[PDB]
Design a protein around this nucleic acid. Structure first.
Lengths: 258, 184
RNA sequence: UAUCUGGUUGAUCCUGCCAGUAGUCAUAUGCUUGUCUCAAAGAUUAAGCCAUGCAUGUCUAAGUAUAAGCAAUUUAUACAGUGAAACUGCGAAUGGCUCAUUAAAUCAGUUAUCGUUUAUUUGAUAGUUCCUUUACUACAUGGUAUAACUGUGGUAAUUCUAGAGCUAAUACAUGCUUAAAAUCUCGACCCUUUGGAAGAGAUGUAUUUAUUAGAUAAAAAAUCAAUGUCUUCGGACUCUUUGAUGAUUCAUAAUAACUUUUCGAAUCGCAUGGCCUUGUGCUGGCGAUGGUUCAUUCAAAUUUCUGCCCUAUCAACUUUCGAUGGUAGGAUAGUGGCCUACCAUGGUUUCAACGGGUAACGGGGAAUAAGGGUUCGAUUCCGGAGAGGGAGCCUGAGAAACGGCUACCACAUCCAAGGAAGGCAGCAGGCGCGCAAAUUACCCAAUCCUAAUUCAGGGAGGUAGUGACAAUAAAUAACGAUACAGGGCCCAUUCGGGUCUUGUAAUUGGAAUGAGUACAAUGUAAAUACCUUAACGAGGAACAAUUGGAGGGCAAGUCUGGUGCCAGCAGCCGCGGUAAUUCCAGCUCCAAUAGCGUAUAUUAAAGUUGUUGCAGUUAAAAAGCUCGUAGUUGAACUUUGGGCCCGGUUGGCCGGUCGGAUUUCCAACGGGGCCUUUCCUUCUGGCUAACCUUGAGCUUGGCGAACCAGGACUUUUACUUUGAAAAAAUUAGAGUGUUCAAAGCAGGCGUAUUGCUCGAAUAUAUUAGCAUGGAAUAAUAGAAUAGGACG
RNA sequence: ACCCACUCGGCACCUUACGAGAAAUCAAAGUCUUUGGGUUCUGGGGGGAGUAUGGUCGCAAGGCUGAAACUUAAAGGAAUUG
RNA sequence: CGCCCGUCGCUAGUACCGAUUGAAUGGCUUAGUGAGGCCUCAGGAUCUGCUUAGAGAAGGGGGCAACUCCAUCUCAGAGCGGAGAAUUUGGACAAACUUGGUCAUUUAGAGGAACUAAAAGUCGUAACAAGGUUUCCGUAGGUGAACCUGCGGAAGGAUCAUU
RNA sequence: AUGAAA
RNA sequence: AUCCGUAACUUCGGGAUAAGGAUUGGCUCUAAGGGUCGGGUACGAUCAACUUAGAACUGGUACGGACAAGGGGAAUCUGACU
């Protein structure tokens, strides 16, 4: 329509934000950023509909403007900034550090963690290229573009970063038999320990993946997210660890935790 | 632009209107359970028909069909929680068989009459709508309740109305003022 | 919840239709209407015309402020506080409204950009700017207005504007200031000739062109054009380095130039910090702004396969002057007939082209159903189109903008007649159109958006009003005793009681709150409403429930009066011609109930559209008969067989758990593998594998896929299985006490001070597209005057 | 040329009624609600109407294709008794 | 004494033909005129930088007397340039209008010929029985009307039957 | 040869 | 004159130059279209004609420049025609 969009209704906003179909017929549009539109969590929906630390966007703007908040080691004083996958946020108040990861129910969880677990993150390499003047570089899944990494670091690998700079703490390559995390599809939030893969040269590299209950499935190689090696995750993981039990098994779980 | 509020009925009219058998049976039911509306009767029959369709198209399925297991167990759970069904009949065939009479006796008005706070189901109706009642610690003025049996244990008259004390009555104060004026 | 009924006959069976019947977020209307909650609403006829008034403006600490504006700096002599107007920068291309257009077009799924732009954000990113490069030039920094304002003013009118005088910049036009090496040229000079050379210009970024590199199946030999490395000048010759890609003239690097010359900070707020070579020397922080390139993100435009309603009373269509292709060029941001020059003459078609029509925008979806299905879908979400019809274009990253300009066309307004300004299919509202459709209201409190920005604005939006469109709940009345009539039981002492019945009642009494009034608080931006509860508020005359109908289908009068085939009723049948069970009234009675009917459209019914699943002798219907193209359909056969093992599911002993779970399990059930003439691609490899490899009972060495890169033959499909993916809302459905319910997605639990805590599942997702195990079924070419395979 | 028996193909026939059909009736008018061998053509209540128009063929007569408006609850088939 | 056909006559409706070179509406459109912007050839009001440019003669510095050095208000004059509107050639884009053609959608109409409907209209009595000439099909002719006649065909015939 | 309407 | 387009009606032959529109000069060029002679037991040389098409440049948009040289359409009556 004659130019960029600026508005966003509810019911075009994604499902997993869990925004309610009442309460005004307009929704918070994620302004552009280092993450996409849909696999992103605005800070407004975060603060206003995950913690209830505020009730209204006016209050949230007060918060963002008084700068209790900071992402990537930076204040990021916008009410609708994309808090994407894996991302880190640090709050002086309560001295908390929340991390933005997924749950198996297909939602952005709220992973309470410490300042060092915030001070490092994870990032999937999106691609690698050679910039001008012969500077090899790569770019991640969070719009971060980084220069002079190891040549051993290639595509589909994952990096662990300092968060005071965009430099590397370490890296993990992609190969058969490594612990991963899923981003896309019915498997949103699974953790399923690569068992093998398949090429289909021409499009849609596919991967057969199963979690420790033997339970297997198949996913796209650009929807997966490698988090390190089998056993140790490089971070702390949320309730469930990407399992997707049955409706009845979860019913029994909660009925035990009545 | 505001997404429109869903609405959907809770009843269904008779396919064929004038069947004397149908009319007399449902009149018996209305005149015993203290009802005003074939609307209400159709409504309860419609709920029963929905659950019965579910029962049919579930027992169509094999055993250990996890859909059958989950949904049938939840159906059992709500039926025992509401009390139309027993605490020992979970085999789904009693569910095929259950009755509008069962629903009606689990309603509040005739329950009130059985408990004896009415002297007539119609007396229960007028007491309900005049708020001389509360099933828990909050007043209710609706006959159609489908009690959950915790209410049954917790029944009492309205605390904030006579027959549970706390006030003599509107016309009670009226009569008292009348006799005060007479003595004056 | 896979249902039928009445009606052609004197009657019967049938076809066959009609009517009845049920429903509709399908509309209109009628009669009526007390309440709580939610809420649609000028689409249909006119995308018809529109008065009036709003609907997009906008600043911080931080671009420019002497407002001859206002407080006071007194920490500040330049201000340094605030601050209209104005310059500037952003945005005004989103929203919102309607559905006129449009029938391979949009659109939906599905691909690509190895064929492109992309403000903004976000991550990274400008030692190279003195150009006779030595005076050609401030870099503790350079030049120019101009607005606002002062005032002169001019028109009847305009967001009309001139004239003269100021002044500012992140507005304009300009502008130097930091390394080191390294090759080319020259080339002084020596001159050598094996040939050695000081000194000088260049090189950042960006554009344009040309060129090179950007890789790499395998091992040795003969030399030299001249040995080239260093020399035993016998020749040892190795050393070599290049990423990604499915795949590129890719990324990227360098030579040689091009540029009318691109970027390389003259910007701004705070805080003021350190060295002394004691100089306003030198260095220093947290920021905002902008800035070249690359990537990213929100986008955008093109694009692959598949798919669209009715029409043959439309069969040929397209190409003059682009139709199909190709070459070269132009344009584009980019490919490309997008356009041109030239050239070949092709391209689509009964597998329905082309043309016409459409009360056609499409889809997500809605009603309705056993299945199959039929119908609708402007209409809250997605994509498209439009701003009265058309055309054009400026600004801009982004428009073919219309709440922006230019014109024409039809409309229409103000004129102090010279001229001037507009396009409600935005919110309200009005005219007209009609069967058919709300207030010229309040608020930004929320949901969001926008700006310089927390602070302002927003008829987007929320709120309230009209509102019987549709949905949820549910009042209008009840209870004791007193005159009758019962049913069991006891007495069976008669027909006495009847204890108790359950009703019948010109019986009577209470208590009993609601509707409406509320004082109030609460509600909400303020409210008005809901809930709360005071105070006031019933015995029916009270506070008064209607709408249809009583012959049938179809439940409900053999009641009264009136009427007399008249008046009138009735969907169908039929009633009425002086005893009307139908008409008009009274009474009574049944149906549904704050709703009920009526008219029209549509689904079920309807196996009266029939793929499932119709009929064709006579009920309508077999072409007069034959040939025949496309089309649909088309005989049988080519691998069976057995053995051998293997391990999974189901039970089945033992339950060795007190109705859970295990073993040898006999058996079945489907699955994997070997052989039976059954190669069921092999060459290079490394794993050499499973290793014949065995060291004394755990040792040193088997045949490449079981990991993988490739070379390789991979004749074609349909089919079928599985998976990724298919935007939400919706639908079905989990849980959930909105007081139930429709709803919604919340809620629940505390030691109620620290607080704790499950949730917001799951399913469905057609064809088509990708991968996908199979190889039955259907065809499908194969080597026959063998250009035949292994060779 | 006859007779007998058999055979393939033809015009048909007698009887049954398993089967079918609404019935008459039928060796297919069967093997169809226990609904599917293959294909073509036609009908969707009665009339209007095989009318009107437009094409098209024919010298013409006329033919092939071929609606609608409007109207209507019946027309019609087969059998029974009268 | 059943049912029933058609003409003719009255009343009402619906559609058809129809002179009218009929009328409108909309779309496509040859040709012609062709605005308006945009691009390109020029244009040149206007403003404006540089380069000199000589002098009417002030000021001071120096032969201190004519005379000499530079600045100066001045004005031509000259080029060296920058931007530059009005206007302007040509081009592609192309609204609107005129005129025809054409495609569909509605529509007026003297009159004519039909159809349908309508409690009791006239003329006959064609049909149903052998319907009183067995009926019907096609074709041709005829006449007030149903209808008759000829040629061939059928049984839905009044016959399933002559060894 | 015909035989009114319900 | 060239190009474009062309109704009803029809005896299917016509109507039809239907109607109705556009263009046309000069100068400089370009393309094609021919005749005859030529090869050891694809092609060259050489000669002269008019046509048709197209493109630049030009002009006080003029140009079949004088002469020459159809007005048409829809219908009636009537005779068929020459």
């Amino acid at each position: 329509a004659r130019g960029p969009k600026k508005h966003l209704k509810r019911l075009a906003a994604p499902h997993h934000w869990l925004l309610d179909k009442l309460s005004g017929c307009y929704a918070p549009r994620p302004s552009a950023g280092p993450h996409k539109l849909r696999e992103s969590l605005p800070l407004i929906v975060f603060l206003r509909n995950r913690l209830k630390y505020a009730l209204n966007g006016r209050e949230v703007k007060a918060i963002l403007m008084q700068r209790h908040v900071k992402v990537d080691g930076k204040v990021r004083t916008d009410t609708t900034y994309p808090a994407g996958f894996m991302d880190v946020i640090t709050l002086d108040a309560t001295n908390e550090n929340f991390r933005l990861v997924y749950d198996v129910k297909g939602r952005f969880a709220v992973h309470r963690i410490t300042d060092e677990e915030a001070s490092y993150k994870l990032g999937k390499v999106k691609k690698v290229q050679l910039g001008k003047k012969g500077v090899p570089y790569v770019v991640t899944h969070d719009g971060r573009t980084i220069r002079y990494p190891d040549p051993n670091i290639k595509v589909n690998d994952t990096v662990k970063i300092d968060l005071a700079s965009g430099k590397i703490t370490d890296f993990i390559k992609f190969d058969a038999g490594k612990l991963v995390y899923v981003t896309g599809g019915r498997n949103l939030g699974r953790i399923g320990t690569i068992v093998h893969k398949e090429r289909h040269d021409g499009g849609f590299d596919l991967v057969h993946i199963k979690d420790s209950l033997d339970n297997t499935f198949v996913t796209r190689l650009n929807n997966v997210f490698v988090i390190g090696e089998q056993g140790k995750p490089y971070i702390s993981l949320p309730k469930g660890k990407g399992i997707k039990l049955s409706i009845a098994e979860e019913r029994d779980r909660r009925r035990a935790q009545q | 632009p505001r997404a429109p509020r869903t609405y959907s009925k809770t009843y269904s009219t008779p396919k064929r209107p004038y069947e004397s058998s149908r009319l007399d049976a449902e009149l018996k039911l209305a005149g015993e359970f203290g009802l005003k509306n074939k609307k209400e009767i159709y409504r309860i029959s419609f709920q029963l028909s929905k659950i019965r369709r579910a029962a049919r198209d579930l027992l169509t399925r094999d055993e250990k069909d996890p859909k059958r297991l989950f949904e049938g167990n939840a159906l059992i759970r709500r039926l025992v929680r509401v009390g139309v069904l027993s605490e020992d009949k979970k085999k789904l065939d009693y569910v095929l068989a259950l009755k509008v009479e069962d629903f009606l006796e689990r309603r509040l008005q005739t329950q009130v009459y059985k408990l004896g706070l009415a002297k007539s189901v119609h007396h229960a109706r007028v007491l309900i709508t005049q708020r001389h009642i509360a099933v828990g610690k909050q007043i209710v003025n609706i006959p159609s309740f489908m009690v959950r049996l915790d209410s049954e244990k917790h029944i009492d008259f309205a605390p904030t109305s006579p027959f549970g004390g706390a006030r003599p009555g509107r016309v009670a104060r009226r009569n008292a003022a009348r006799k005060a004026e007479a003595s004056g």
